[PDB]
Amino acid sequence: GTGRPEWIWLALGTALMGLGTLYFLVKGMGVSDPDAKKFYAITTLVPAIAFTMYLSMLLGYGLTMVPFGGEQNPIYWARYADWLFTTPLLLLDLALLVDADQGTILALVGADGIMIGTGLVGALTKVYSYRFVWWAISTAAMLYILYVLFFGFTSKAESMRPEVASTFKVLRNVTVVLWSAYPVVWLIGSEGAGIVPLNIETLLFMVLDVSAKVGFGLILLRSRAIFGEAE
Ligand SMILES: CCCCCCCC/C=C/CCCCCCCC(=O)OC[C@H](O)CO
Ligand SMILES: CCCCCCCC/C=C\CCCCCCCC(=O)OC[C@H](O)CO
Ligand SMILES: CCCCCCCC/C=C\CCCCCCCC(=O)OC[C@H](O)CO
Ligand SMILES: CCCCCCCC/C=C\CCCCCCCC(=O)OC[C@H](O)CO
Ligand SMILES: CCCCCCCC/C=C\CCCCCCCC(=O)OC[C@H](O)CO
Ligand SMILES: *C/C=C(C)/C=C/C=C(C)/C=C/C1=C(C)CCCC1(C)C
């Protein structure tokens, strides 16, 4: 375990996702409003899944070796299993906040599946140049998601309760900034051009993950927007 220099960041990420899970679980104890229950369920599941996958990387299960560029490169595949389930859950939190139509939700979740699935194929591809073909397709899927969040969701939120509009705007801005950093880290890190070493890459993903899951959830679950309008 400690033989890998990045272990300290995997351990800290495990601890922070675990603590985030427990906090959201206790905070949601006793909430009875059915609308608020939806948001607590979605938002608590996100760090719980990430906890299990950080733990699997810490213990060494979620790591494989991929040959490319004449070397055996360590690839943490467990990240993609986490993101496959947690990134559509985070998009569902945003879509439910603005009462998105069903067709738009399907488009978002489908594009997200394509983004993570092609990222995984790129991470495991043995022909070096082809890794960047998959990165470009995945990045195009991400740009579709970001477009919808700005030129689809923002338009509907502005016609809803003011507390829904303001909370959405903040969570939208947090999401766009944090999610856009992931393709950059991948491209310059061990999966891509290899300019940043794996230990620093692991630190960067851990800061992004904790911010995009526990930070996001703290903003959402402290908002009055998750409760129905009632007397
Ligand atoms: C919110 C409060 C928390 C604030 C925290 C946010 C900081 C996020 C971390 C960033 C990257 C820093 C990585 C450290 C730099 C290591 C690079 C290095 O030293 O490599 C030298 C090499 O030997 C010769 O080039
Ligand atoms: C050190 C602590 C480690 C961290 C803990 C280990 C994580 C894996 C454990 C459990 C799944 C528990 C349930 C996860 C689902 C929670 C959903 C929820 O809370 O739903 C609220 C809603 O209001 C209901 O109607
Ligand atoms: C609303 C959506 C609900 C979503 C709830 C789903 C959460 C499941 C999470 C985690 C366990 C990780 C499972 C990862 C499976 C890896 C098994 C595998 O393929 O291993 C192959 C072997 O290691 C050859 O290398
Ligand atoms: C493997 C990746 C895919 C599986 C991972 C799970 C990701 C989240 C699940 C589903 C989106 C499907 C559409 C669900 C949107 C329905 C929300 C809605 O419009 O409201 C319906 C409700 O009946 C009103 O009361
Ligand atoms: C819209 C928000 C999301 C946008 C996300 C897409 C951004 C893509 C950016 C840049 C490509 C820059 C490529 C630079 C890579 C050159 C690496 C190289 O070969 O240089 C070797 C090294 O510099 C010698 O030490
Ligand atoms: C909880 C973790 C989050 C919000 C992770 C988000 C991940 C991404 C937006 C990943 C994007 C990628 C690309 C657009 C191309 C290169 C490969 C990925 C998967 C890193």
Numbering used by the authors: 4 to 234
How does the study describe this entry?
Structurally, bR shares the seven trans-membrane α-helical topologies typical for other rhodopsins, as well as G protein-coupled receptors. The primary reaction from the bR dark state to the K-intermediate is the isomerization of retinal from the all-trans conformation to a twisted 13-cis conformation that stores a significant part of the initial photoenergy. Here, we investigate the effects of increasing laser power density on the light-driven proton pump bacteriorhodopsin with a focus on the K-intermediate that accumulates just after the excited retinal chromophore returns to the electronic ground state.
The thermal load can be followed over time when analyzing the atomic B-factor difference between light and dark datasets collected at 10 ps, 100 ps, 1 ns, and 10 ns delays excited at 1281 GW/cm2. The relative B-factor difference on the counterion cluster and retinal continually decays before disappearing after 10 ns where the heat is nearly evenly distributed throughout the crystal as evident from the maximally expanded unit cell.
